[PDB]
Amino acid sequence: SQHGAGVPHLGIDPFALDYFADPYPEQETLREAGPVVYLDKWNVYGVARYAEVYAVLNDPLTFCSSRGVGLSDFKKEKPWRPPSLILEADPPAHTRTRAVLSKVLSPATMKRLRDGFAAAADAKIDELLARGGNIDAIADLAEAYPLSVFPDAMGLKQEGRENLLPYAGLVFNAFGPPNELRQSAIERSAPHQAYVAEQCQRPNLAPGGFGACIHAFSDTGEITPEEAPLLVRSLLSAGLDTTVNGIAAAVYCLARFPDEFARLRADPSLARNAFEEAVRFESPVQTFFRTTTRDVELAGATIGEGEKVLMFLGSANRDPRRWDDPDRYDITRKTSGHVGFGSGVHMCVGQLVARLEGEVVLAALARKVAAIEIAGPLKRRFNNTLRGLESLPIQLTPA
Numbered sequence: 001s002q003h004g005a006g007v008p009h010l011g012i013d014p015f016a017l018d019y020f021a022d023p024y025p026e027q028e029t030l031r032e033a034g035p036v037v038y039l040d041k042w043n044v045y046g047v048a049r050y051a052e053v054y055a056v057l058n059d060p061l062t063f064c065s066s067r068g069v070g071l072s073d074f075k076k077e078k079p080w081r082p083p084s085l086i087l088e089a090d091p092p093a094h095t096r097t098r099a100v101l102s103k104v105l106s107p108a109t110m111k112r113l114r115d116g117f118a119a120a121a122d123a124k125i126d127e128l129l130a131r132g133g134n135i136d137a138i139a140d141l142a143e144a145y146p147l148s149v150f151p152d153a154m155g156l157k158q159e160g161r162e163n164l165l166p167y168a169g170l171v172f173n174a175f176g177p178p179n180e181l182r183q184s185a186i187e188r189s190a191p192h193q194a195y196v197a198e199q200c201q202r203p204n205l206a207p208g209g210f211g212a213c214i215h216a217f218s219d220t221g222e223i224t225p226e227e228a229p230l231l232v233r234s235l236l237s238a239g240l241d242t243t244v245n246g247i248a249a250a251v252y253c254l255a256r257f258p259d260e261f262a263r264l265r266a267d268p269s270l271a272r273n274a275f276e277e278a279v280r281f282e283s284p285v286q287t288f289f290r291t292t293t294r295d296v297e298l299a300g301a302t303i304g305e306g307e308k309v310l311m312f313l314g315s316a317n318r319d320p321r322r323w324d325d326p327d328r329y330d331i332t333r334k335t336s337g338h339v340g341f342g343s344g345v346h347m348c349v350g351q352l353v354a355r356l357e358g359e360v361v362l363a364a365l366a367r368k369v370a371a372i373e374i375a376g377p378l379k380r381r382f383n384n385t386l387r388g389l390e391s392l393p394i395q396l397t398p399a
């Protein structure tokens with residue numbers, strides 16, 4: 001390896017705590033430096049503009065996922081857990097396991113489940129207003145709401161559910177480099193991993209839920225009985241804390257930007273796009289990696305075989321080369337093509353679940369709430385892959 005000959009090198013640590021606290025100046029530096037940069041801190045290439053993020057995402061055989069989508073290269077180091085059969089696979093293996101999850105989380109499934117999700121969101125906003133409206137948008141809403149619907153939709157038992165958010169925090173930290181956040185999460189992981197490992201098994205998943213639906217594909221031969229609990233493991237990894245942070249992004253956006261909330265109230269049919277624009281704007285899933293499978297030319301750079309490439313999805317989603325006024329939260333923006341859910345063959349399989357949760361929460365706010373205001377100090381949460389808040393006191397004014 002030439003280790004980044006011919007491209008600009010930068011010392012920016014995109015996994016440093018001061019960076020997660022305020023990433024936007026360094027994301028701009030990463031974009032301005034060039035289309036391809038080399039990050040000295042971790043000896044990986046980086047792409048922070050929309051054009052190259054999009055190109056890498058849409059070339060999955062060249063920029064592969066089967067050597068891990070975190071920093072660690074699975075060819076060189078044993079993975080911290082056995083690889084995801086969907087996220088950390090390439091076609092054709094990826095095609096067959098993705099197709100199972102695309103059927104489980106299908107658009108018709110979302111329509112059959114819609115009233116359950118919407119009634120829970122209505123009831124939650126009612127509860128928050130009956131409390132007086134002075135509530136923590138994180139604990140009381142962004143966290144509480146997905147906890148009230150997703151474990152039941154999975155068919156998980158009641159007991160042990162406190163393990164779910166720590167498990168997700170661990171998975172998202174573990175894509176990161178071997179820093180304190182990662183080391184510490186892995187050290188405390190055993191009980192969370194054990195809980196998950198157990199709940200993925202068929203006898204532990206209630207009939208009618210997503211878990212049992214996956215396991216049914218083993219009965220028809222479409223997957224094996226040892227694949228089935230791993231595909232359940234994917235949904236327990238990615239299905240809860242992503243939506244918590246996307247809901248948090250949406251509430252935080254609407255709270256800061258009252259004119260946009262008033263627009264949402266005027267036309268509640270903007271709920272879906274308001275949620276999608278929050279996903280662009282905050283990019284709750286900030287980064288993933290790929291690994292080159294061959295020597296490649298990317299935007300003028302040479303990249304050797306077997307190099308990690310860090311994609312900055314959150315910077316791509318704010319890149320002024322692609323987005324008009326990228327730092328504005330605009331709930332009528334044409335958001336199509338943002339990379340907050342990825343792009344191409346691995347584009348979020350659960351996006352219909354995430355959008356259903358976000359829509360129903362925003363629709364309940366649009367109908368029941370006259371105004372939203374930040375009410376007290378916020379506290380940001382640091383995670384190697386996720387962006388979002390630990391606390392956000394708000395005031396909801398009832399309609």
Ligand code: HEM
Nearest residue numbers: 086087238239242243246285341342346348349350353354
């Ligand atoms: C706002 C919430 C969400 C965000 C921002 C998000 C983000 C992402 C991103 C960026 C990817 C691309 C991964 C890559 O390209 O390597 C992805 C894929 C994936 N997501 Fe989501 N996600 C969300 C919600 C969910 C939910 C609710 C589920 C499950 C119910 C889920 C399950 C998955 C799985 C299994 C994949 C792997 C798909 C594949 O590799 O083909 N996600 N997501």
Ligand SMILES: COc1ccc(C(=O)O)cc1
Nearest residue numbers: 084086087233234237238
């Ligand atoms: C979007 O984040 C993830 C995280 C884990 C997995 C998985 O475990 O398959 C998928 C997506």
Ligand SMILES: [Cl-]
Nearest residue numbers: 081193196197
């Ligand atoms: Cl695990």
